[PDB]
Design a protein around this ligand. Sequence first.
Ligand SMILES: *[C@@H]1O[C@H](CO)[C@@H](O[C@@H]2O[C@H](CO)[C@@H](O[C@@H]3O[C@H](CO[C@H]4O[C@H](CO)[C@@H](O)[C@H](O[C@H]5O[C@H](CO)[C@@H](O)[C@H](O)[C@@H]5O[C@H]5O[C@H](CO)[C@@H](O)[C@H](O)[C@@H]5O)[C@@H]4O)[C@@H](O)[C@H](O[C@H]4O[C@H](CO)[C@@H](O)[C@H](O)[C@@H]4O[C@H]4O[C@H](CO)[C@@H](O)[C@H](O)[C@@H]4O)[C@@H]3O)[C@H](O)[C@H]2NC(C)=O)[C@H](O)[C@H]1NC(C)=O
Ligand SMILES: COc1cc(C(=O)N2C[C@@H]3[C@H](C2)[C@H]2CN(C(=O)c4ccc5[nH]nnc5c4)C[C@@H]32)cc2ccccc12
Ligand SMILES: COc1cc(C(=O)N2C[C@@H]3[C@H](C2)[C@H]2CN(C(=O)c4ccc5[nH]nnc5c4)C[C@@H]32)cc2ccccc12
Ligand SMILES: [Ca+2]
Ligand SMILES: [Ca+2]
Ligand SMILES: [Ca+2]
Ligand SMILES: [Cl-]
Ligand code: NA
Ligand code: NA
Ligand SMILES: [Zn+2]
Length: 806
Amino acid sequence: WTATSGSCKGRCFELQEVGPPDCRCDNLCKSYSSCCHDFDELCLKTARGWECTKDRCGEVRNEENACHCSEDCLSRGDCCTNYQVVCKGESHWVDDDCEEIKVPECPAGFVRPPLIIFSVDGFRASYMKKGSKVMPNIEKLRSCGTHAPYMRPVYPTKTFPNLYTLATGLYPESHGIVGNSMYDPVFDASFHLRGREKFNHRWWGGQPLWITATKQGVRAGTFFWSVSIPHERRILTILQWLSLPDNERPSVYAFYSEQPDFSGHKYGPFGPEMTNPLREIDKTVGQLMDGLKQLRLHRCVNVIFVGDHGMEDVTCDRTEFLSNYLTNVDDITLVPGTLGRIRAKSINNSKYDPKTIIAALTCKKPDQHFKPYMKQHLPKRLHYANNRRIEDIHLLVDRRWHVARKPLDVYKKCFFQGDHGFDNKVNSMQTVFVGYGPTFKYRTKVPPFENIELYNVMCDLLGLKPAPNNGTHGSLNHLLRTNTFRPTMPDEVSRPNYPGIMYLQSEFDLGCTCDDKVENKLEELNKRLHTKGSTKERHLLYGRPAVLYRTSYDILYHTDFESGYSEIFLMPLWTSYTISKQAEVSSIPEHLTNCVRPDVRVSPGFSQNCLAYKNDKQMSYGFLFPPYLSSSPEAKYDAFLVTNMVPMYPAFKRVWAYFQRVLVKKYASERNGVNVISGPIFDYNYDGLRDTEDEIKQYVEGSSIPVPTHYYSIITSCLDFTQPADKCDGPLSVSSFILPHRPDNDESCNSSEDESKWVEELMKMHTARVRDIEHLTGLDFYRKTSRSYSEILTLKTYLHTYESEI
Ligand SMILES: *[C@@H]1O[C@H](CO)[C@@H](O[C@@H]2O[C@H](CO)[C@@H](O[C@@H]3O[C@H](CO[C@H]4O[C@H](CO)[C@@H](O)[C@H](O[C@H]5O[C@H](CO)[C@@H](O)[C@H](O)[C@@H]5O[C@H]5O[C@H](CO)[C@@H](O)[C@H](O)[C@@H]5O)[C@@H]4O)[C@@H](O)[C@H](O[C@H]4O[C@H](CO)[C@@H](O)[C@H](O)[C@@H]4O[C@H]4O[C@H](CO)[C@@H](O)[C@H](O)[C@@H]4O)[C@@H]3O)[C@H](O)[C@H]2NC(C)=O)[C@H](O)[C@H]1NC(C)=O
Ligand SMILES: COc1cc(C(=O)N2C[C@@H]3[C@H](C2)[C@H]2CN(C(=O)c4ccc5[nH]nnc5c4)C[C@@H]32)cc2ccccc12
Ligand SMILES: COc1cc(C(=O)N2C[C@@H]3[C@H](C2)[C@H]2CN(C(=O)c4ccc5[nH]nnc5c4)C[C@@H]32)cc2ccccc12
Ligand SMILES: [Ca+2]
Ligand SMILES: [Ca+2]
Ligand SMILES: [Ca+2]
Ligand SMILES: [Cl-]
Ligand code: NA
Ligand code: NA
Ligand SMILES: [Zn+2]
């Protein structure tokens, strides 16, 4: 109940929310049907429109007007934004040359440059180039400020998950807004676009920027605007708030535009109808910047122009129906559209079975436009599993397509020509970032970056300590003129042992064999040097990774590779090696096909054993440093050490072998040498974080050898490819992956074909940031480079997407 009989007189767009049944006058009161009776009359004035005209110049104040053109308007803070232009012979902000803003030029009594976040829904990255003719204000922010070619959204590329990730710096699995639609089984409650449940605070996890600011004594304008409040009124409200007394005035503000998303859904991302919405957004930006200029704030405020996601061409005729695959289609509930999430319609149905649903959806039609996954098998770069609101069964839908349960849902629920939600690496889903103001750099282009990073930067802009989040703080320091955040590298927690030769061959009873009893002070001295680390500078180029948790491990040196060998997990945490452009690929000699050799530096008790692999009819093994890339026949023996062995399903070995035999040499040829670091990952609870020993769900049969859920590789070279990877003077280039360690290749529909037809496509789908591997392994890479730490943080957040040009 709201007793709407109170009044909004002197309360219009009040910042504190008043408690029911007292009536509200804040920017969301309409959405609660809670506004006071006179809210429209007093707070949503429209008389005479939004622009001063020559005849209004110097008018007597009429309080009924939407905005004012009287002499007193500037000190009242309610002039129409074009007041000084029409009445005082000023220029529009857009017509002024840009001039570097070296320091904040703020009115007296501003404690810090305000931040204004101008968020645009569905603003695809290519609109910045493609719409530039019709967006001159935005084009001036972009060219004069700091801008990225694009900004990567989070998955799913839907409205609420992305706006809330912008506000919190968290992945959707962590903030809890995992879709535009959700069911939470613990709450037994549904979050829907239409309706009231979404207003309940319990859905919204983490700590969004307005709460971070308020907790730290920084006042915030309310971010949310009832849809019916026109944009001009939203802008005038923000400008009025900026004229509040110092003690009352917020330092952070947000504007939100439903465009261009609204029209993009109707007309497609590039429909002829899209020009007008783009023009109208630009005009709103112009009103804001003219308004700031009138208030002498246009060289004081930091402005961020940011989108939540892009927009793709999607039409009703491009819909896959689960009723074409499933017999039991009425026993499931689907969250449909540009992603699918499936659960049981009824928890009382004992015959529901996810395994049979997955199989019925796997590679059933030649051109099938979605792929099913249990959520723990989705690409780790999506970070889309660790939340009870994410259904166990997920469908990744091809760009341009929809999935639905039955045809009746599509023609009884064609209109739309655009949609979004797809994989956040898809070019059409990318969005925009521009930063303009005293704290941003001048005329600076920065590489693309992910929207999870921005919360930290907004905290930096406001002098706030960010709440714990998924950004890597410092990775965006290069956007900023000042207020950079200068972190220290994390401290290594475990120091390694450096074992020498400590065990005799006969102490090992591992069930391993190797034809290696085949035989010189010239070259016996040489093998000893290699085992003590004499080639380490060639193979460990960026220092050894630091172990950031408590464990027992050994550094093992070899001619061709160095490794950090875990006594707890019985295999390397990492193996590092460099392959030059000139390196040669050889085969595993016949006599060595089944060779596994005890490592006399590592106890039998801390070794794997061959007998366990023999007994495990499902599990085989592979090697982290590949014997194919051995530098010489003698060095090849090192590659068959039991300490270089890792458990691998035969299906996975197909992938791994092709990577090691073919692709590493291919990258070294293309990149002028590469340094590779490979290793296992254990994430049985799909939380994106390294498992402890007691979380491992699978072991090689009859042993304590844990089975990895994934295998990673980090492939680094010189950004200037005229220099070889091992003699690089400047910036680095990296690509990485986190391949799922699966007992079948059901994910790859063409896997019956030669690996040259499917493996590389699999690897691209499972592309990763170094930072993703760090989370998953508790390792910290690039400890010893000649590069600044911020530059290295940026390198660690880099994702190689394999998408053509934006
Ligand atoms: C991305 O960044 C984020 C933020 O840094 C990272 O997420 C953090 O990860 C931490 C480690 O997993 C985790 O720390 C835990 O906190 C528990 C207390 O949590 C509450 O309080 C905080 C602080 O205010 C709050 O943020 C939390 O909010 C979560 O939960 C509510 C729902 O209840 C949501 O509204 C909100 O969205 C958020 O949900 C997300 O995280 C939870 C996990 O907390 C997931 O379950 C959800 O799916 C969703 O992802 C909470 O309100 C604390 O209880 C934990 O401690 C237990 O476990 C450790 C492990 O040994 C141990 O030390 C403790 O003893 C304790 O164990 C006991 O309880 C166990 C569980 O019941 C039990 O099994 C044992 O037997 C023991 O009895 C833990 O320290 C932190 O909460 C989240 N924070 C957020 C915001 O998500 C994230 O990892 C980053 N991602 C990547 C890939 O790097
Ligand atoms: C400016 O910051 C914010 C503004 C806001 C905020 O005011 N809103 C108003 C609108 C939009 C953002 C939400 C989504 N929606 C829709 O009808 C909608 C829109 C586009 C769609 N495309 N496809 N399906 C769609 C469904 C209703 C809400 C909400 C926020 C929520 C969290 C964090 C920040 C927010
Ligand atoms: C977004 O994050 C939070 C939001 C809140 C919080 O005040 N909430 C949660 C809901 C609503 C009020 C905001 C607005 N929005 C809407 O859907 C919306 C926006 C404009 C509209 N016009 N017409 N209909 C509309 C619907 C989504 C957000 C409280 C929180 C409390 C703690 C942590 C986070 C919170
Ligand atoms: Ca949207
Ligand atoms: Ca076996
Ligand atoms: Ca884990
Ligand atoms: Cl959704
Ligand atoms: Na032997
Ligand atoms: Na297959
Ligand atoms: Zn949309």
